[PDB]
Each structure stands twice: as C-alpha cells, then as structure tokens.
Amino acid sequence: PIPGVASVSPANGAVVGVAHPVVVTFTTPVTDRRAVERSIRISTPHNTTGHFEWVASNVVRWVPHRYWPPHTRVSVGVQELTEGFETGDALIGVASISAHTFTVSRNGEVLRTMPASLGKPSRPTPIGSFHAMSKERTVVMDSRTIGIPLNSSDGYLLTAHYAVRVTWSGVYVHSAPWSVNSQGYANVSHGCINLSPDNAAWYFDAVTVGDPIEVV
Numbered sequence: 001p002i003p004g005v006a007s008v009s010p011a012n013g014a015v016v017g018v019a020h021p022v023v024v025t026f027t028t029p030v031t032d033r034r035a036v037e038r039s040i041r042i043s044t045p046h047n048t049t050g051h052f053e054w055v056a057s058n059v060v061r062w063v064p065h066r067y068w069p070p071h072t073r074v075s076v077g078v079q080e081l082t083e084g085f086e087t088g089d090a091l092i093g094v095a096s097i098s099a100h101t102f103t104v105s106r107n108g109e110v111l112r113t114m115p116a117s118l119g120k121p122s123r124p125t126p127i128g129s130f131h132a133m134s135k136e137r138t139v140v141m142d143s144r145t146i147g148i149p150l151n152s153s154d155g156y157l158l159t160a161h162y163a164v165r166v167t168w169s170g171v172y173v174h175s176a177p178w179s180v181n182s183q184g185y186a187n188v189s190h191g192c193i194n195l196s197p198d199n200a201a202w203y204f205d206a207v208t209v210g211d212p213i214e215v216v
Contacts, residue, residue, distance in 0.1 A: 002032070002035060002036070002039070002079075003026040003027050003028040003029070003030055003036075003058070004026065004027040004028075004079070005024060005025070005026060005027070005078055005079050005080075005081055006025045006026055006027045006058075007024075007025045008022070008023070008024050008025075008076055008078065008081060008083060009021075009022070009023040009025075010022070010085040010210070011083075011085070012083040012084060012085065013084070013085060013086075014085045014086070015085070015086050015087070015088045015208070016085060016086070016087055016088070016208060016209060016210035017087065017088065017090075017091060017131060017132060017207075017208045017209060017210030017211030017212065018064075018067040018068045018069070018070055018087050018088075018089075018090045018091075018092075018210065018211070018212060019064070019067055019068075019129070019130070019131035019210055019211065019212035019213075020068070020087070020131060020209065020210025021053075021061040021062060021063045021064070021131070022040070022042055022061065022062040022074070022076055023055075023059065023060075023061040024036075024040055024059070024060055024061070024062075024078055025056075025058060025059045026058040026059070027058070028058060029057035029058050030054075030057065030058060030060070033052075033054060033060070036060060037052045037060065039078050039079060040052075040060070040062065040076070040077075040078045041075075041076070041077040041078065042062055042074065042075070042076055043074070043075040043076075044068065044069070044072055044073065044074045044075070045069070045072055045073065046068075046069045046072065048064045048065065048066075048068055048069070049064075049065045050062050050063050050064040050065045051063060051065070055168070067090065067212060068087045069087065069090075070087055070088065070089050070090040070107060071086070071087060071088065071089070072086065072087050073085075073086050074086065074087070087210075088208055089106050089107050090105075090106070090107050090108070090212075091104065091105070091106050091206060091207065091208065091211045091212075092104065092105045092211070092212045092214065093132075093173070093203070093207075093211065093212065093213045093214070094214045094216060095116060095118060095125065095173075095193045095213065095214070095215045095216070096116075096216050097118050097119075097124075097125060097127070097187060097215065097216065098216075100115065100116055100117060100118070100182075100183065100184050100185055100186065100187065101113055101114060101115065101116050101184065102114045102115075102116040102173065102193055102195060102199070102203070104203060104206065106206075111206075112199070112202065112203075114195055114196075114199040114202075114203070115183035115184030115185075115195075115196065115199070116183055116184070116193055116194060116195055117176065117179045117182040117183045117184075117185075117186060117187055117188050117189050117193075117194040118187045118189060118191075118192075118193055118194070118215075119187060119189050119190060119191040119192070120187055120188050120189065120190070121187075122154075123154060123189070123190040123191050124187075124191060125171060125187075125189070125191050125192070125193060125215050126167065126171065126191075126215060127215050127216065128167075128214075128215055129212065129214055130166045130167055130171075130212070130213045130214070130215065131166075131209075131210050131211060131212055131213060132164050132165070132166070132207050132208065132209050132210060132211045132213060133164075133165040133166065133167075133168070133209065134164070134165040134209060135163075135164055135204060135207065135209065136163040136164075136165070137161060137162065137163070137204070138159060138160075138161050138163070139159070139160055139161075139163040139172070139174070140157070140158070140159050140160075141156060141157070141158050141159070141160045141172075141174070141192070142156075142157050143155045143156045143157065143190065145170055146169070146170045146190070146191070148190075154190060156190065160172075160174040160175055160176065161174065161175045161197070161200065161201075162174055162175045162195075162197070162200035162201050162203070162204035163175075163204075164203065164204060164207055164213075166193065166213050166215075170191070171191050171192060171193070172192045172193070173192070173193040173195060173200065173203060173213070174192055174193075174194070174195070174200055175194075175195060175196070175197045175200035175201070176189065176192070176194030176195065176196075176200075177196070177197055179194045180196050182194075183195065183196060193213075193215075
C-alpha cells in the first residue's frame, strides 16, 4: 500500500539552476523504496541520467549526473501528479579550499574569481558537489545549529548577510567582513564560504536556487 505524494520540488513552471534535484515528499514513511522510485518519471530532452537518494523516511530526491543542461525543460510525473519546470543558465560556483577562492562562471564564461575563506582544518568546509538551496539577505549564524555551545571556543552568534545555503547541515556562502583579511590567504571560518560584503552581494544577486556549488 503506497503512500500519497505531499509535494514535488521544483514547483511547476519554476526556472531553476542546473544542479537542482527533483525532490518528492510523501505523506508517510516509505517502506517500499523501489516501488516509489519506479513511480517517479523524469524526462528531459538530453536524457540526463542520475540517481535517487533517500534524505528522509518520506523524502527522496533525484540528482542529475553532471547537471541538467541549461535552458531546458524537465517533466516530472509521480502517481496522479504531473508537472514541468525549466533550467536557466549554468551558473557554477567553485570554492577552492587550497586556493582560498570562489570562482563563478556563467555558461562556461568565468565572471569572477573572488577571495574566499573556507573552514579551518578543525571546522572544515566539506568537499563535494552541492547546489544553492536558499537565498537569505539576512540570517542569524548560530553555532548551536551545528552542535556547538555558545560558550565553547568554536561558539559564535552573529547576523550575516547575503547568505546562500550550500548544505542541509548548515554550510553557507555569506558576507564575512570580520574575515576579509584572511580571504584569499587563509581558511579561518567554522565551515562557511566567507566572502567580502561586495562579493557576497554580487553572488547573492546572481545566484538562483539549484545553481551548482562545488567545493574542491
């Protein structure tokens, strides 16, 4: 007995970045995962391949291998639901732990190579292939939301701006005026990709939810 669908992301008619997963949420925990995966039909003109990942008992996402093509249509069907969305430009951000840089390219054209400070060795930025999950002009960075008491040495509580969520577990790209001196030279954050206010603002204005963010 199959659980009903609660929602699909992206929403119908959205224009998303090229690493946006198709996320299907169900009304109950899923017991037969293979049946749910077979039920999810994703179609795109370039026949992009990919794989399912179970990120909650009732949530599965399909992650496209090597990104969607830019400016393409994607159809999604599951049970009684059908929808369509599109991709926009391929706007790729590469955060380099060794180079201390965040490099953003649009459709192969490099737009900015920005000074960045990533996580210090004890509180590192995770290597991986991620996407922009949200845009928040202002956000409270609270160390308790990554498991660190405020009074501990790695504790922090502050308001940051131009915040783009990179991971489900709290890595952001954001404006970090306090670390401008380290940006381009040293990795001194608690895991976030620290940019200057002006570079963070530029990126924040350019970025779309779904846009790829690679940490290397």
